[PDB]
Assembly symmetry: D2
Homo-oligomer: 255 residues x 4
C-alpha cells in the first residue's frame, strides 16, 4: 500500500511520532526516524515490519540540523514522499511568567521547524508529482488553554501554515493537512499529570481530572489511531483533502 | 471488517449515497438503501459485493415515511449500526426571493431528517454499545455562498447537531461526526459538464475555480472511504467533528 | 445617532429583546416591539425615550403572523431600517428523548423566523439604500452542549444564514451580522439555575453578559464603523469560545 | 469616554495604528505612539485633541527595544491601561522559496512582539484592576492565502495567543481580544491603487477576497477598539472579531 514510499517522521523516538512511524512501516513505507533519546527501540520497532529505517538525531531548533536530516533522507532513500512534522515540546506558565527562552524554544520547534521541514520536502514532492505533508498540530491550534501561551500560538501557527501550503499545492498531487489531537498519554502529558499530582497526591486521580476537564469521552486518543489517520490521508481518498485541520479529540472542540 | 454490521445510507439510489453504500458493502456491511426512483440499479450494485441489501423509498420530509424506513431496517436486520445521513437538495435564489416551499423542504430534508434519523437510530446503538452516525454536511455547513440561504442554514444546523450528538454519546462506543465535502463529481454535475458540443476539463476548471483551489472533484468513493475510516477503531475518539474534504475550499 | 430610523426587535416584550430595544430607542430609533406576555411595561420603557413605540404580539413560529408583524411596521412606519432577529426559546433533553414538537417549534422560531424576518425586511432596505439586520444567535451557533439538539442546530443555521445575507448584501449599504452571547442572566437562564455553577462549566469570566452590553454592540453594528462588518458572527461570552 | 487613560499603540506613525490612536485621543486617552519615520504629523494629529502624546521609535523585533518602549510608558504615564498591538510586516513568496530571514522577521514583529508587549503591560493592568489588550491580527489569523506562509502563521499565532490571555484574565477586569481586518486602506495600499481608474483598481484589487469591494478604514478600526474599550466590551474575552467586508463569510 505504501511500498515504494519513504516517510520521514520528526520526533518519532517516542509518543505520537513513534506510533505514526510504526503504522506507516506496517503499510510498507521506508522510514527516517528523528528525535532525542535512545533511537534503538524505535529502529527495532520499525525493522519488525520488514521495512528499512535510519534515524538522525537533528535538534530541529537548529535550521542547519534540519537540513542535515533531510540530506540523510535524500542520500539513504532518494527523497521524502511523506513528511510527518510531529516533533514538539510543552511548557506551562501564566503569560507574564512565561520564560522568554521557552517562548522562543516552543516557537522554534513547534512552529518554525514545521515550516523548515515543509520547505525542504516540497521541491522533491512537486518534482515527483506526488507528496503528503501532515502536521501534528493540536486542539490547541483551534482553541486555547490557560498557561499555554507559547504552544497555543505555535499550534495555531501550524494550522495557518497548513492552510497556506495546502492552498499553494492545490493544483498538484501534493497535499498538506494537519491532525489536531486531543490528549494522548505520552511523556509530554504525564509531565502535566505529575505536576498536577505534585500538591495533593494521586497520579491516577490527577490523570482522570486532566482528561475529564477537557475531553468528554474520558478516553485518551492513541498514537496508533493517529497513525491510521495519517495513513488515510496518504491514500487516494485523501487526494482532495487540502489545507484541512482534522481533530481527533474525544469531543474537546465540539463544546 | 464491517462483516456483521448494518448500514443505512439515505439518498443512496444514485450519486453520493450510492458511492458511499458501495464502499460499506465491499467492507462487508449489510445495506438499507433509500431514495426516489427505481431501486433496482442500486440494489444490484450492492448485492454483487456478497452482502444483503433492501431498499425503502421513504420521502424524508415526512416523519412517518422516515419511521417506515427505520421499521424496514429493523424488520430485515435488527436495526442500524452505521447511519449515514446523506441528502441531496439544493435551490439557488437571493434570500428575499427565496421560495418558501424551497426553504421548508431544504430545512426538512437537509436538517430535520438528520435529527429524525438520529433519534431513531441511537437507542439501538447504545443498547448494542457500538454505533456510528455520519452526517454528510457540506462546506456550506462551515461557510456561506450567495443565493444559498436554505442550504447553508440546514448544513450549518447539521454541523451543530453533530456536535450535540457527538457530546451526548462521548462516553460510549457510539460516535457522531460530519463530513463536509466541496464540489463532488455527481451524475448531475457530470451532466452540467458534458453539456459541451468541446472541452470538459476547462468546463470543470470554470466551475470549480472560484471556490475550489484544486480545480478537481471530490468523488463519492473518496467519501465512502472516509465513512469507512470513521467506522474503524481509529475512528473511536473522533466525536462531534466536522471534517472537510474540499480541494482547499475552507483553507481560503 | 439613529433618529428617524425604525427598528423592529423580535422577542422584545422582555429581556435581551427589551434591553436591545431600549438602546436603539435611546439612540433615537422608533421601535416596533414583539412578543408575548403584555407590552405596556415595554411600551412605556421605549417611549420614556420620546420615540414612537408600537407593538405586535405575533407568534413567530407562524409565518402568516410574522407577515402581520411586518405589515404593521410597514403601515406605522413605511417599513424597517433595522431588523433585530431575537425571539428564541429553549428545550433541554437528550436527542433521542427530544420532543418532536419541541424540535419543530425551536427550528421555526429560532431559525425559520429569522429567514422570514429577513426576506420581509430586506426589499425595503435595498430600496431605501440602507439597512441593518442583526441576528441574536448564541455561543451555541458555534459549539454544542449536551441536551440542546434543536437549539444548537437552529443557532448554527442562523450563523450560516447570516453569512449568505452578509455576502448577498456586501455590495450595498445593508449589512447582516450575528451577535453570539454566552450566558445572560434572564428568566430563561435562571430557569437553568448558585449561579457560579451554571457559569463555571461554560463561561470562564464567571460573570453574566448583560442585555445592555448586547444593545450597545447592536448600536455599534448600526453605526458607520459597522459599515464593512458583514456576515460576521461576533461572540460576547466571557471566554466561552476561547477554550 | 477615556479621560484619564493611557493607550499605547504600536505601528502608529501612520496607517491603521495612527487611525486607532486618533480615535482614542478623541475619546480622551493619553497616547504613546510607536513606529518609524518622522513622528511629527502623528504627534500633532493627537495634540489636535488636547491629550499628551509621546513617541518611541523602537524596533519591536528587538526585545530590549520593546522593553525600553514600556519603560518610557512607565515613566511618562505610570503605565499602559490600553495596549494595542498593531505593528505588522509582510512578504510574499511561495513556501519553498520563503526567505529564511523574512520568516524569522515576520514571526518576530507580527507574533513574538505581541507576546512581549503583553507580558509587560499585563502586571500593571492587573494591579490597577482595569485593562484592555487588543491585538490587530488579520483575516489571515483565521484563513490562509497563497504566498503568505509567515504572515498567516504569525497572525494565526496571534489569534491563539489572544485566546490564552483572554482566558488567563477572564476572572479580572482585564480583557484581551483580536480585531481581524480584511483589506484596509493604508498608505502602502493607497500607493498600490495610485499605480494602477482609482475605483476600478480598488475593485480589481478587492474582488477575490473582499466581497464588498470597499475598504475597511483605520477610523472604523479605531471605533471598534473604542467599543472593546467601553463597558459593553467587559465580557468580550479571547475573541477574534473580523471586520472584513465579507472575507470570512465565504
Ligand atoms: N500528547 C498529546 O496530548 C498531544 C496532543 C496534541 C498534539 N500533540 C503533539 O504531538 C507531538 C508529539 O508529542 P508527544 O506527546 O508524542 O510528545 P513526546 O514528548 O512523547 O515526544 C516528542 C518527540 O519529539 C522529540 N523532540 C523533542 N524535542 C526535539 C527537538 N528539538 N528536535 C527534534 N526532536 C525533538 C522527542 O525526542 C520525541 O521524539 C508534539 O507536536 C505535540 O505538540 C500532543
Ligand atoms: N439568555 C441567554 O443566556 C442567551 C444566550 C445566548 C443567546 N440568547 C438569545 O437571546 C434571545 C432572547 O432570549 P432571552 O434570554 O431574553 O430570553 P427571554 O425568554 O427572557 O425573552 C424571549 C422573548 O421572546 C419572546 N418570544 C418567545 N416565544 C416567541 C414566539 N413564539 N414568537 C414571538 N416571540 C416570542 C418572548 O415573549 C420574550 O419576549 C434568544 O434568541 C436567545 O437564544 C440568550
Amino acid at each position: 500500500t505504501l511500498k515504494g514510499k519513504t516517510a520521514l517522521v520528526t520526533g518519532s523516538t517516542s509518543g505520537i511520532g513513534l506510533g505514526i512511524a510504526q503504522v506507516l512501516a506496517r503499510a510498507g513505507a521506508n522510514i527516517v526516524l528523528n528525535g532525542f533519546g535512545d533511537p534503538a527501540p524505535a529502529l527495532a520497532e520499525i525493522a519488525r515490519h520488514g521495512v528499512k529505517a535510519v534515524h538522525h538525531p537533528a535538534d530541529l531548533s537548529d535550521v542547519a540540523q534540519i537540513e542535515a536530516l533531510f540530506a540523510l533522507a535524500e542520500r539513504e532513500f532518494g527523497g521524502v514522499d511523506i513528511l510527518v512534522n510531529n516533533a514538539g515540546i510543552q511548557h506551562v506558565a501564566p503569560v507574564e511568567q512565561f520564560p522568554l527562552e521557552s517562548w522562543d524554544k516552543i516557537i522554534a520547534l513547534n512552529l518554525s521547524a514545521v515550516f523548515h521541514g515543509t520547505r525542504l520536502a516540497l521541491p522533491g514532492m512537486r518534482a515527483r508529482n506526488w507528496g503528503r505533508i501532515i502536521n501534528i498540530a493540536s486542539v490547541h491550534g483551534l482553541v486555547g488553554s490557560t498557561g499555554k501561551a507559547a504552544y497555543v500560538a505555535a499550534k495555531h501557527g501550524v494550522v495557518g501554515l497548513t492552510k497556506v501550503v495546502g492552498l499553494e499545492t492545490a493544483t498538484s498531487n501534493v497535499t498538506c493537512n494537519a491532525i489536531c489531537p486531543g490528549w494522548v498519554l505520552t511523556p509530554l502529558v504525564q509531565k502535566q499529570i505529575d505536576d498536577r499530582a505534585a500538591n495533593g497526591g494521586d497520579p491516577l486521580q490527577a490523570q482522570h481530572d486532566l482528561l475529564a476537564e477537557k475531553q468528554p469521552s474520558l478516553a485518551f486518543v492513541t498514537p496508533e489511531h493517529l497513525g491510521e489517520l495519517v495513513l488515510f490521508l496518504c491514500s487516494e481518498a485523501g487526494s482532495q483533502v487540502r489545507g484541512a485541520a482534522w481533530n481527533v479529540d474525544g469531543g474537546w472542540l465540539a463544546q
